[PDB]
């Protein structure tokens, strides 16, 4: 499914992302927008032979297993296919582990390029 902006804000709130590792909920919503355009089924083949999966475009080299990626480590211990559903739980769980490493949200390339330092809270403004 393609989530609405305020709809995804709320799911992410209920899943404990607001202020997770100091990153406010607009951060997470802005990330989704520019990574997947709110589309839980989005998949993109990358220049290193890895693939990114799901609403937060979780990567198959470091975090999930798709069976076909060079130097994969599977640090989330999950199949990438399990991240393409309308339930964002597994993407969120993997997000929390990702953001707890050195890199913080800089692990999401669209976040660091389009979101970082911006009025990210505008992404959840007007939501209930």
């Amino acid at each position, epitope marked *: 499914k393609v989530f609405g902006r305020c709809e995804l804000a709320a799911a992410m709130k209920r899943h404990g992302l607001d202020n997770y590792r100091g990153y406010s909920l607009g951060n997470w919503v802005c990330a989704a927008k520019f990574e997947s355009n709110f589309n839980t089924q989005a998949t993109n083949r990358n220049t*290193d032979g890895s693939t990114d999966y799901g609403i937060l475009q979780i*990567n198959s080299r470091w975090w999930c297993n798709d069976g076909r990626t060079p130097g994969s480590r599977n640090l989330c211990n999950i199949p990438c296919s399990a991240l393409l559903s309308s339930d964002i739980t597994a993407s969120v769980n993997c997000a929390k582990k990702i953001v707890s490493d050195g890199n913080g949200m800089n*692990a999401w390339v669209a976040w660091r390029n389009r979101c970082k330092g911006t009025d990210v809270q505008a992404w959840i403004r007007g939501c209930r």
Partner: nanobody
Amino acid sequence: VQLLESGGGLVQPGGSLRLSCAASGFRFDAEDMGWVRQAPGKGLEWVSSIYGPSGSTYYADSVKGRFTISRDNSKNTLYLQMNSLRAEDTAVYYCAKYTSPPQNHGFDYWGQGTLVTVS
């Protein structure tokens, strides 16, 4: 930080070609790096990688056994040896790297690119 590819050119099928990539502004010897190409009217496609201090190499299936990726640490230069060239190997080739790993989007930094034409 900079990557700068040379020298593609025209080669007959069956021929060979060695590409280089002069690298600067970072610690070359242990950096994850690779080659990517963009063929006429297709997206960027991964070709090869070399990872970490071990220098573990990986290759896309269309090139395995024909290409070899190499580092020259003394000169901070990355090489791609291309043998047994075929018409479908025609593409712009790019040397590439991660700007801030671990990350998504694959390699996000690449050079200007060098053209290889195989006819």
